[PDB]
Amino acid sequence: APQQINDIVHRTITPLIEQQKIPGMAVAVIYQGKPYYFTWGYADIAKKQPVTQQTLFELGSVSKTFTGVLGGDAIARGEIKLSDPTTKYWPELTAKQWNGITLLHLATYTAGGLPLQVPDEVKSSSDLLRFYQNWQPAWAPGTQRLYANSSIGLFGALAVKPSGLSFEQAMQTRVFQPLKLNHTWINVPPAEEKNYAWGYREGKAVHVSPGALDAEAYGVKSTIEDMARWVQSNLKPLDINEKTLQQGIQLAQSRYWQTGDMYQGLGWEMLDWPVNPDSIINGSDNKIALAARPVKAITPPTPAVRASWVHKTGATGGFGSYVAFIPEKELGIVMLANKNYPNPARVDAAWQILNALQ
């Protein structure tokens, strides 16, 4: 890789790893369209397995970007419409509070205060129906944004209903395969477990636990190579042959709502570039990212803006990930670590690297 990339990456990541005490980490920088990989530490401390370009990391909430694009693809296929009421795809949701709540609201966390997490006691499909039926919104739809797995999670499950395919089935055939993301999984197969890094929380090795709507909200595992390819695809969707998928990616980057300097897409979140580091770094801190914030509707949605800082942070009990890219500069980065460390530190490092390259 060019010495400039090598230097900025290493001089930025090495200190990060030491300060946050990250066991293992993989980084990919997309420069002028080409990917450059970097790896450090361990995927498995006990077995001394190093992090490689083939190591699988839990993406946590970065999984929402895949869900958003899969949803966008479904829209492009004409199977669903974001303006459709949630009840059109789940007739059993007869509770009056759902009148007025559309798939758009679910996909963008603006349904009226759906909870960040689906309760652990929710296992069965009837438990899930009950959960949504009994939920009482704190606000009218389309007025406030509250980041929630139970929101985009339901969107993902409903978006694939028409296709008749399971969520994982649809994701593999409509997104992973067409983009040649052959080492990205919702459920890691036995054959790939040798590459599945362990996450670490308080020194204990851990893997994400099964949960309702986990696949749709935080269940994707992937390699730094496939993630770099995911970034490349989102940087230049037009180079994608699959028509509906090309459209789907564009739809996930459209700006639907605005809160402060941030715009909400489908999974992806965007800010106008050039951005102000502290405007995104501090904004990343769960304090701001997870808070209840009034939203302004963008009517109609603004098509993907090339001059944007597009990103998504992600975490599970033992992993921390970050993806950010700037279409206009054909620049991007992916940071995967097997320790969930502070979001501000991730964005600060990412900024430091990308700003230096353009």
From Swiss-Prot:
Comment field (misc): The class C beta-lactamase family has a specific amino-acid numbering system known as SANC, for structural alignment-based numbering of class C beta-lactamases, or else the simpler name structural position. A multiple sequence alignment was used to derive a consensus sequence and then the consensus was numbered taking into account insertions and deletions. This allows use of identical numbers, e.g. for active site residues, despite differences in protein length.
Protein name, as recorded: Beta-lactamase
Gene that encodes the chain: ampC
Entry-linked Gene3D superfamilies: DD-peptidase/beta-lactamase superfamily
GO biological process, one term: response to antibiotic
Organism: Escherichia coli (strain K12)
Record note on quaternary structure: Monomer.
Residues annotated as the enzyme's active site: 61
Keywords for this protein: Antibiotic resistance, Hydrolase, Periplasm, Signal
Record field: catalytic activity: a beta-lactam + H2O = a substituted beta-amino acid
Induction line: Can be induced by beta-lactams. Expression is not up-regulated by the non-beta-lactam inhibitor, benzo(b)thiophene-2-boronic acid (BZBTH2B).
